Design a binder for this molecule. Structure first.
Ligand SMILES: C[C@](O)(CN(C1CC1)S(=O)(=O)c1ccc(O)cc1)c1ccccc1
Ligand SMILES: C[C@](O)(CN(C1CC1)S(=O)(=O)c1ccc(O)cc1)c1ccccc1
Lengths: 219, 221
């Protein structure tokens, strides 16, 4: 379903999820899992609201969402913390830092990775419109197959457009494109270490069963 | 340290290239895979050192980088080595594997499928040799003195943007193709991770030679 890149960015602007509005050992585990669940509900809705997503296979829709909920959640946290150095804005109410993450053993390294990546995004001077395309691509590339390639190339065109609209040379444009794209490897990296810890906490019972993200964690 | 033109970098990468390696069961075939990996790794360290600016990096960094991507750089090599042979994986000339012989090892066939699917995705984009070299090098430099690395990466990025330009296409089709191969690298890393997960649940006998080679990096050579 063909449309202009400017239009795709606007529908992605609208599709955006509402802001979820919410120290000891287990208290922060259930606060984070509470937020992750509430946010996941919004993600599925957000994902469905992406043009062409619901036209995709039932298998594909699930396999995609399954393989990136963690990353899309982290990318969201990265944008929330972009203009707050040394802080991770999980929710506008519940804000945490490096010296706050020391509560649980093993959870320190992930907060460091997230902050380091947020920093790299801050240095990059990442725009809102640039970010939206990035999040959608994170979801569509975390893998009908041809319909997906089309939907991805659409958000790729939508990102190439936002990068052109900033007003810079063909070299500085392409360089900036590749910059954020290679910075996504670092988001996925942090997402994997988070999944290895999340699945380990499920197999430790420090985090509750609760809802939805329990359904996500299994498959 | 360098203000070397992108064409000259693409050339250094071409000169730096390792010699291809030439070395039916389920474990001695898996032993063949680990034997091939260990010897190709020797060439990789050499190749890595031969990249401009790499040896100027922290020796700790040099090892950390090589540690986090030997598997991926090896797999990227296999996909270039398989680009023009649909349905097969040219590991070595004397070791060609395909869909018909991965079922023998526990969850190895899954990796083969991923590897073939990605190779397919690379032939559909008609990936050039010069495009591949920049990609391989970036895989290594981005798998993470830190400032020197960002410079070296931006250099290979410029070297890739240049080969993308030299093919002669519109500014939209240029940027679209850049992002295409860059997003296809996520799929290479994905397959790499699956492979590392397998290797980690295997006996230590297998990871030891990798680590011994990586710590052999204490020069001269
Ligand atoms: C601290 C955290 O990064 C939290 N996350 C996991 C519980 C879902 S989370 O996915 O990073 C996350 C990110 C943003 C949010 O608004 C909500 C959650 C983490 C990672 C691994 C293991 C435990 C917690
Ligand atoms: C099937 C395979 O993908 C083989 N690999 C290494 C263990 C040998 S490998 O890393 O994928 C590989 C890649 C390129 C080569 O030229 C040779 C090997 C694998 C990966 C991890 C664990 C076990 C086997």
């Amino acid at each position: 379903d063909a449309l202009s890149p400017e239009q795709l960015v606007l529908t992605l602007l609208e599709a955006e999820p509402p802001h979820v509005l919410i120290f000891t050992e287990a208290s922060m585990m259930m606060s984070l899992t509470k937020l992750a669940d509430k946010e996941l509900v919004h993600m599925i809705s957000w994902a469905k609201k992406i043009p062409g997503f619901v036209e995709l296979s039932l298998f594909d829709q699930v396999r995609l969402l399954e393989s990136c909920w963690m990353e899309v959640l982290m990318m969201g946290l990265m944008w929330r913390s972009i203009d707050h150095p040394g802080k991770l804005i999980f929710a506008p109410d519940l804000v945490l830092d490096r010296d706050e993450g020391k509560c649980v053993e093993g959870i320190l390294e992930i907060f460091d990775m997230l902050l380091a990546t947020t920093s790299r995004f801050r240095e990059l001077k990442l725009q809102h419109k640039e970010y939206l395309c990035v999040k959608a691509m994170i979801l569509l590339n975390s893998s009908s197959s041809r319909k997906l390639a089309h939907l991805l190339n659409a958000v790729t065109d939508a990102l190439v457009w936002v990068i052109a609209k900033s007003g810079i040379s063909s070299q500085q444009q392409s360089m900036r494109l590749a910059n954020l794209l290679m910075l996504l490897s670092h988001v996925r990296h942090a997402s994997n270490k988070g999944m290895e810890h999340l699945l380990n906490m499920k197999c430790k019972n420090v985090v509750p069963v609760y809802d939805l993200l329990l359904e996500m964690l299994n498959a």
